[PDB]
Design a protein around this ligand. Structure first.
Ligand SMILES: OC[C@@]1(O)OC[C@@H](O)[C@@H](O)[C@@H]1O
Lengths: 159, 159
């Protein structure tokens, strides 16, 4: 057994659709070049953007930006409030998202990140970026960018 | 497809060390409390410790400490020089280690971490800690702790 070196342990596969998560924003907005590339779409074309935040005992720990290319999902995703985003989508539409690719990196918090995660400038973040496809195939339905306070959470994975 | 946030990408599920990794040390040594817990052995009993490092043009990128419980691997492991340590072990003994658990954290380098990875105080590191098993058994075979400069490497995983 490996002991935990951070206060909280989070399963990597569960982290993007956590059940204590709260929606902070749900808007239609033009796709940045980086969002457009992940989704396989055109820069500046509208995407659904939801931002969610989870706290533990008040303390913001994980902020996630979720981008979907399928605007048919808008009347559904705008009604998400709190809880597991993917569970919400699945009950509403029967669409079950599964992960295709994950990227994990660490960087110093800059700018709007410090503000939204409520942390001092340059505090380390773990950044987990995932492409999810419908239980089906290989056109990503969701690109999510999660930023977690590295001083509070360690990710775990069982194989 | 996702852009890369770092100069180099390493597969999170790749076992052992990079094909250009060099051995820094192979020794028998008493297990520390963390190492003994991971390997499910008594603190203080000997383990084989190998340390490897990947550099690019002299710049240290990825340091891994690998700790094996089976001392009978010593004739093999003391002979490792460079390359993929898991490929070397497999070529020499037939043992192909498989992962049971992974923990990923991030932290700011200090003291001996800054010395070994040749980086400034507080430089962000990704720390990846894994337990690996010979096909089947309760006893893990190997506990490894990777420390990688987060300004130079991002991890990827295909699902
Ligand atoms: O970042 C906000 C804060 O409340 O988070 C928990 C602790 O790290 C406190 O130092 C810190 O001010």
């Amino acid at each position: 057994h490996m002991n935990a070196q951070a206060r909280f342990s989070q399963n990597l596969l569960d982290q993007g659709s956590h059940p204590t998560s709260e929606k902070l924003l749900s808007v239609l907005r033009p796709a940045s070049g980086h969002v457009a590339d992940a989704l396989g779409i055109t820069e500046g074309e509208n995407v659904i953007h939801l931002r969610t935040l989870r706290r533990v005992n008040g303390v913001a720990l994980c902020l996630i930006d979720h981008y979907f290319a399928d605007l048919t999902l808008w009347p559904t995703l705008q009604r998400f409030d709190s809880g597991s985003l993917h569970d919400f989508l699945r009950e509403q539409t029967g669409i079950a998202l599964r992960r295709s690719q994950t990227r994990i990196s660490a960087r110093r918090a800059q700018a709007k990140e410090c503000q939204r995660l409520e942390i001092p400038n340059m505090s380390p973040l773990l950044c987990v970026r995932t492409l999810n496809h419908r239980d089906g195939e290989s056109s990503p339905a969701e690109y999510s960018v999660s930023l977690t306070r590295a001083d509070m959470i360690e990710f775990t994975m069982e194989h």
